[PDB]
Each structure stands twice: as structure tokens, then as C-alpha cells.
Ligand binder design. Structure first.
Ligand SMILES: O=C(O)CNC(=O)C(=O)O
Ligand SMILES: [Mg+2]
Ligand code: NI
Ligand SMILES: [Zn+2]
Length: 331
């Protein structure tokens, strides 16, 4: 078995290897990369996502989210308070302000220490989930707005024909902006490209051990657990590496820098934070190996997680028994 310790693997494809996305994903899995839950892909040196970022300030963040924390430093939840719209120019200036900027630090490790020590005492503002793309249309390799769609994967593998579309999303971060512990909708893959700015640190639990993280989360957030049988789908809970180590949960960590892709694999729980002002682009995708994960994915039926138009069809086809009760939560 390849990669039996479930380490995060790092790939350096050549420009020739960067032509066929699906094939490269299947290559990485042949080497065991999926067992970690997360892989890093460093693009060929000749590749570029776009020529410059020189006019991005005009993008609008229609609903910036202030991430307010509750709990203790190592075990907390966050709630997203909606703020008034602002441009990316305005957001970048806010990120660089004395109140919000990255503190002095020695290296990534000292910064990670400061994040876990101090996150809960601040409320950074996150521009999340903004439909759009920053890839140039002329970028033909690994362009996240030109991927094969999940609906087309389900049609090719299973013959079924469903509504829905699959488009990317932009994320604008600042110091301390946080993504809570989650897997993707329907336990899909994700791919995330860091277009610019400061790094993003990731934590991940190997898919084969996801249920260990779930059981810890039920113990740490016991009222949330009683409220919903899949409350990590709400994307609000944080657990620190120290707490994971104290409780024996297998995990890994890695820092993504500008210019790098990350792939998350089906049922790979992940969480993380941004080091400073940055912009990422991400999208879900499927392969044939996903289908079984989609059939088995948990769902939030409490109604909090409230998910997309396109996820309806996935549930309807892969989880027809749940269909009914899940759409009661989504209507
Ligand atoms: O970058 C972020 O804030 C969150 N992204 C992801 O969870 C991802 O790409 O799957
Ligand atoms: Mg602009
Ligand atoms: Ni994710
Ligand atoms: Zn729920």
C-alpha cells in the first residue's frame, strides 16, 4: 500500500505532465496521496495563472464576514457576522491596518503558535465564497474555471443526467481568518489555488480516520452534536493541533504559499488559517473514486448547513432515501 503513514505529499509536475488534469489526479492517487486527505501541487515553472493581478481591487466583497469566536483557545466555535460590502481594495487596506495586520514573528512556526494562542481574542474579516475566477481564459492548464463538471462525471460514470452547474469561488483572507473543520459537500474533492499574498496553513485528518475526528468533535461540542447528526457540516468548529495530539487524533499540517495548488480528497477533514492578506480560488470536483464517498456522505438535516442548488441533485440520485428528510432541512 502506498503512503501508509498518510503523509501529505508534494508534487512537482512538469509542463508536459500538467496537461491532463484527470490523469495527474489519478497519478497522485497511484502514489497514495489521497491517504493524507490533502496534497500540494507546485505548478511547472513555465506556468502562470494570469499575467498580472494589477486590477483586482475592483472586485466586490458583497458580504464580508466577521469571524467571532467563543470558547477556549484550543476548542472554539466561530460565528459569522455579516458586514457592509467593500471592494477588494478596501479589504486589502483593512487587512494591512494596525488592528488587523500580521504581527511580528520569527517564522511560520512562531506565527502558528501566535494564531492558536491568540485567535479567539480577535475577529478577523473574511471575504468568502465569492462566485468568480481569476484565471486568465487563455490559461489552459489547471484553470479552475475550465474543469470537467461533477454533473458530467456522474453522467459518464452512471449514465444519469441531472441539472446543476459547478463554478469556482474566490476567498479573500487576512491574518487569523479561519476555515473550520469540514469535509466538502457530498464528500467531494476540492482544489484550491493561492493566487496571491500571504500563506495559508492547513491541517488535515486522513480519510481513513475521519470518524475519530467526528467522535472527538461530538465530545468537545456536545450540545451541537445533540442538535445535528452532522454538525461539522455547519463549518463552525475549531480544534487545535495541541488538542488533537492530546486526544490521539491522527493529522498533518502544511503551509501553502502563493502560486501553489492544494487538493483535498474525499472525506479528508481539513481546517486552517491565513497568515495575512491573500486571495485563493477553489472549486469542488469529482473522479470515479468519489462516487462511493458521495453515496455515503453524511448530511445536515437540522437545516443549518443549507446548501446549493446543485447538491440537491447529487442527494436525489446518490442518496434517494435521504432525499425527502434532507430537502425538509433545505426548505
Ligand atoms: O481557503 C479557504 O478558506 C477554505 N478552502 C477550502 O476549504 C477548500 O479549498 O476546500
Ligand atoms: Mg478589479
Ligand atoms: Ni474545504
Ligand atoms: Zn445541521
Amino acid at each position: 500500500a502506498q503512503n501508509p503513514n498518510c503523509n501529505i505529499m508534494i508534487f512537482h509536475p512538469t509542463k508536459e505532465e500538467f496537461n491532463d488534469f484527470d490523469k495527474y489526479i489519478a497519478y497522485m492517487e497511484s502514489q497514495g496521496a489521497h491517504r493524507a486527505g490533502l496534497a500540494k501541487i507546485i505548478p511547472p515553472k513555465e506556468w502562470k495563472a494570469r499575467e498580472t493581478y494589477d486590477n483586482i481591487s475592483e472586485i466586490l466583497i458583497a458580504t464580508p464576514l466577521q469571524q467571532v469566536a467563543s470558547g477556549r483557545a484550543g476548542v472554539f466555535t466561530q460565528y459569522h457576522k455579516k458586514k457592509k460590502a467593500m471592494t477588494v481594495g478596501e479589504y486589502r487596506h483593512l487587512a494591512n491596518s494596525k488592528k488587523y495586520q500580521t504581527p511580528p514573528h520569527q517564522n511560520f512556526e512562531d506565527l502558528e503558535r501566535k494564531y492558536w494562542k491568540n485567535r479567539i481574542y480577535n475577529s478577523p474579516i473574511y471575504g468568502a465564497d465569492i462566485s468568480g475566477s481569476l484565471f486568465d481564459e487563455n490559461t489552459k492548464q489547471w484553470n479552475l474555471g475550465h474543469l470537467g463538471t461533477i454533473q458530467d462525471l456522474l453522467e459518464k460514470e452512471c449514465g444519469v443526467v441531472i441539472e446543476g452547474v459547478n463554478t469556482p469561488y474566490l476567498y479573500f483572507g487576512m491574518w487569523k481568518t479561519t476555515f473550520a473543520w469540514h469535509t466538502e459537500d457530498m464528500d467531494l474533492y476540492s482544489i484550491n489555488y493561492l493566487h496571491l499574498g500571504e500563506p495559508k496553513t492547513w491541517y488535515v485528518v486522513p480519510p481513513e480516520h475521519g470518524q475519530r475526528l467526528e467522535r472527538l468533535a461530538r465530545e468537545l461540542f456536545p450540545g451541537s452534536s445533540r442538535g445535528c447528526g452532522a454538525f461539522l457540516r455547519h463549518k463552525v468548529a475549531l480544534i487545535s493541533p495541541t488538542v488533537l495530539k492530546e486526544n490521539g487524533i491522527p493529522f498533518n499540517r502544511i503551509t501553502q504559499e502563493a502560486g501553489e495548488f492544494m487538493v483535498t480528497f474525499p472525506y479528508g477533514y481539513h481546517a486552517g488559517f491565513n497568515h495575512g492578506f491573500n486571495c485563493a480560488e477553489a472549486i469542488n470536483f469529482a473522479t470515479p473514486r468519489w462516487i462511493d464517498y458521495g453515496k455515503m456522505a453524511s448530511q445536515c438535516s437540522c437545516g443549518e448547513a443549507r446548501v446549493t442548488f446543485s447538491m440537491d441533485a447529487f442527494v436525489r440520485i446518490l442518496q434517494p432515501e435521504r432525499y425527502d428528510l434532507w430537502k425538509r432541512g433545505q426548505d
